[PDB]
Design a protein around this nucleic acid. Structure first.
Ligand SMILES: Nc1nc2c(ncn2[C@H]2C[C@H](O)[C@@H](COP(=O)(O)OP(=O)(O)OP(=O)(O)O)O2)c(=O)[nH]1
Length: 627
DNA sequence: TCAGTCAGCTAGTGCTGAC
DNA sequence: CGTCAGCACTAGCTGACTGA
């Protein structure tokens, strides 16, 4: 059929005869500021749409290039940018199309599969390189990952998902794809009926491109509305920080963290042997063999028939650790707890990690998200790096490149500093400008001891009590809290004494507590002005939201500043989990990387917490788990 | 030729736990 | 502390193998 090959020369199979070629005169501006009546060919669909979204476009091929096309990108303040790929596995997938949508002009499609010369790209490369150009991208992490992975460098992004989900105040956790965003904000219906059609083939149907163009173009009107809205609520600082934080996260995904196959294999063997001996020990102790050990009901029944009793002689009703913590006396319970520890460690780490190692590079790559978390903290998906255990320094398996060295850092008591800033408390500022940790003050005032006499146990108690009641935790609940992360034994009178003693001097904390509990606002706001509207009031989460949101914001700003500064020595950002950032630099640059990291994080802290200076616990380590 | 099971799949609790 | 994961496990639901 000649109909299906109407524009086969442009690598567009005419599956549906609903198209038309057309070449118009364009009054583009010359480099000498002279209007030139050039002309390029653009394709249109015979069937229009009720929407005002642009539908024309150009396809730039190896043999459809005209050098004057680059003038369309000249002297421009913003451009949309949509990227479509063959799949989802970035390390082994090729970018399919690069979309650019200039205002009052058709979308420009770079048919990458049909591009073999450099001249077409360098204009687009320069267009991406400019720092006075804003890029509108849907879920900018995706497109940025693919761009940097195929030798591109973006230097300004205004992702629509970031701004929208910041605006939504976490009212809803779903319905934020492109169609939902346009539906909500614009009065348009994109009709995303494309069910992921085939893309790997060079030849692509016409309707497929026509849909692919709309998503690129509609980001422009979306930007026009979203800037006005987001500026209206004074959310420009949070938007700017979050959006400048789209490059470093992408670099962290691309670089990954190396896994030591030799050490991992060794540890798997040793833990397997230990698990075998422990399992045999438990099975012999349980006096039975039919009982599959891992199950909870059957092992509970085994304990019950073993006549296992508590201090009050009652039979054990459950095997919860908080319950098993009460019966450490019995011999079988110790073995059971040990077995469950080893099996949890085994299944959680040593069988999970091998599934998530890119053998082509011997590395583990996360999928970080920056707005999924309630407080805006990061949240590692697929391989959850946060769920890797701290125990034993199991991080020995993770080591840097064969000629590189890690640099580890972390904020020291960021939550307390943020709380002091928000409450404007006098005593915390006094202690901090006195170069004294708040933990020492809490321990002293609890024990009424001299400052030099604060032992490590008192420091632990101070940390526990401070973190317990900084977020408004009922003093009766402290009894259970003690045997939840500190294993401490506490009495109601002692709990009350600590409770009263804290607010007896931490006046600003008490003022903050009373105001939060009294107002019962639905909408809360951070120091970065990040906002959230709860379904109702929740006192603990209410107090928790501002300080932890500010923590996420300060960490993101630090990441942005570190990324910008590290370009001098060409380093790599590898991971950020819990107020802790690790970078990786080859040798001969470590004494400079230390300065870069410390100065960057210090500047980031000085931005937000004006009253209190922050202190960084930096270090240098051959392995992530170094002491 | 179609009732009546049993052999796989699925929802859900439920406990369990460590970050 | 709430937010994930990992388990079995318990039960229920459903099409293939008898049953004549
Ligand atoms: N909910 C909760 N989060 C924890 C706990 N331990 C650590 N985290 C996570 C989330 C917290 O925001 C953050 C607190 O970090 P830490 O205070 O344990 O570390 P840091 O070295 O800053 O301790 P410091 O206060 O300086 O003694 O880490 C815990 O027991 N409970």
């Amino acid at each position: 059929d000649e109909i299906t090959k109407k524009y086969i020369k442009d690598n567009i199979i005419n599956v549906d005869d609903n198209i038309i070629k057309k070449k118009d005169i364009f009054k583009l501006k010359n480099e000498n500021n002279e209007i030139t009546e050039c002309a390029f060919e653009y394709f249109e669909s015979k069937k229009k749409f009720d929407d005002d979204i642009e539908s024309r476009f150009f396809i730039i091929n190896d043999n459809n290039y005209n050098e004057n096309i680059n003038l369309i990108y000249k002297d421009i303040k913003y451009c949309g940018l949509n990227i479509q790929t063959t799949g989802l596995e970035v390390f082994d997938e090729n970018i399919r199309l690069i979309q650019i949508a200039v205002e009052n002009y058709p979308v420009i499609i770079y048919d990458m599969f049909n591009i073999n010369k450099k001249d077409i790209l360098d204009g687009l490369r320069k267009v991406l390189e400019n720092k006075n150009i804003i890029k509108i991208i849907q879920n900018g992490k995706f497109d940025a990952k693919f761009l940097l992975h195929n030798n591109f460098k973006i230097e300004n992004i205004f992702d629509t998902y970031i701004a929208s989900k910041l605006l939504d105040k976490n009212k809803n956790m779903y319905g934020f794809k492109l169609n939902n965003i346009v539906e909500k904000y614009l009065n348009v219906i994109l009709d995303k009926q494309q069910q992921n059609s085939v893309w790997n083939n060079s030849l692509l149907n016409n309707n497929q491109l026509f849909y692919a163009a709309r998503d690129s173009s509609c980001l422009l009107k979306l930007y026009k509305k979203l800037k006005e809205e987001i500026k209206k609520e004074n959310l420009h600082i949070v938007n700017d920080i979050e959006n400048k934080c789209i490059l470093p996260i992408c670099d962290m995904e691309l670089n990954g963290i190396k896994v030591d196959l030799e050490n991992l294999q060794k540890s798997t063997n040793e833990i397997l042997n230990e698990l075998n001996i422990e399992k045999d020990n438990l099975k012999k102790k349980l006096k039975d063999e039919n009982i599959n050990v891992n199950s909870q009901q059957q092992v509970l029944k085994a304990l019950q028939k073993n006549n296992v009793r508590d201090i009050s002689n009652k039979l054990i009703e459950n095997t919860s650790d908080s319950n098993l913590k009460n019966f450490l006396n019995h011999e079988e319970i110790i073995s059971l707890r040990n077995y469950r520890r080893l099996y949890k460690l085994y299944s959680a780490f040593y069988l999970k990690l091998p599934l998530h190692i890119n053998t082509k590079t011997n590395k583990i790559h996360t999928t970080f998200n920056q707005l999924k978390t309630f407080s805006g903290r990061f949240s590692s998906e697929k391989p959850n790096l946060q769920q890797i255990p701290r125990q034993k320094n199991i991080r020995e398996i993770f080591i840097p490149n064969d000629n590189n060295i890690f640099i580890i850092a972390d904020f020291k008591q960021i939550e307390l500093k943020i709380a002091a800033e928000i409450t404007n408390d006098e005593i915390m500022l006094k202690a901090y400008n006195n170069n004294i940790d708040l933990h020492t003050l809490t321990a002293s005032i609890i024990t009424k001891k001299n400052i030099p006499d604060i032992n490590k146990e008192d420091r632990h108690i101070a940390k526990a009590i401070n973190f317990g009641l900084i977020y408004g935790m009922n003093y009766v609940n402290l009894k259970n809290y003690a045997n939840t992360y500190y294993g401490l034994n506490m009495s109601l009178d002692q709990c009350l004494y600590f409770y009263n003693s804290f607010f007896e001097h931490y006046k600003g904390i008490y003022k903050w507590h009373n105001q939060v509990k009294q107002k019962r606002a639905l909408q809360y706001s951070t120091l970065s002005n990040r906002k959230v509207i709860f379904p109702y009031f929740s006192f603990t989460k209410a107090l928790n939201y501002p300080v932890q949101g500010t923590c996420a914001d300060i960490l993101k700003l630090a990441l942005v500043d570190l990324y910008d500064n590290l370009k001098d020595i060409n380093g790599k950002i590898i991971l950020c989990v819990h107020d802790e950032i690790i970078i990786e630099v080859n040798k001969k640059f470590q004494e400079e990387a230390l300065k870069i990291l410390v100065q960057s994080m210090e500047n980031s802290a000085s931005y937000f917490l004006k009253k209190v200076k922050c202190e960084v616990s930096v270090k240098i380590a051959e392995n992530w788990g170094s002491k």
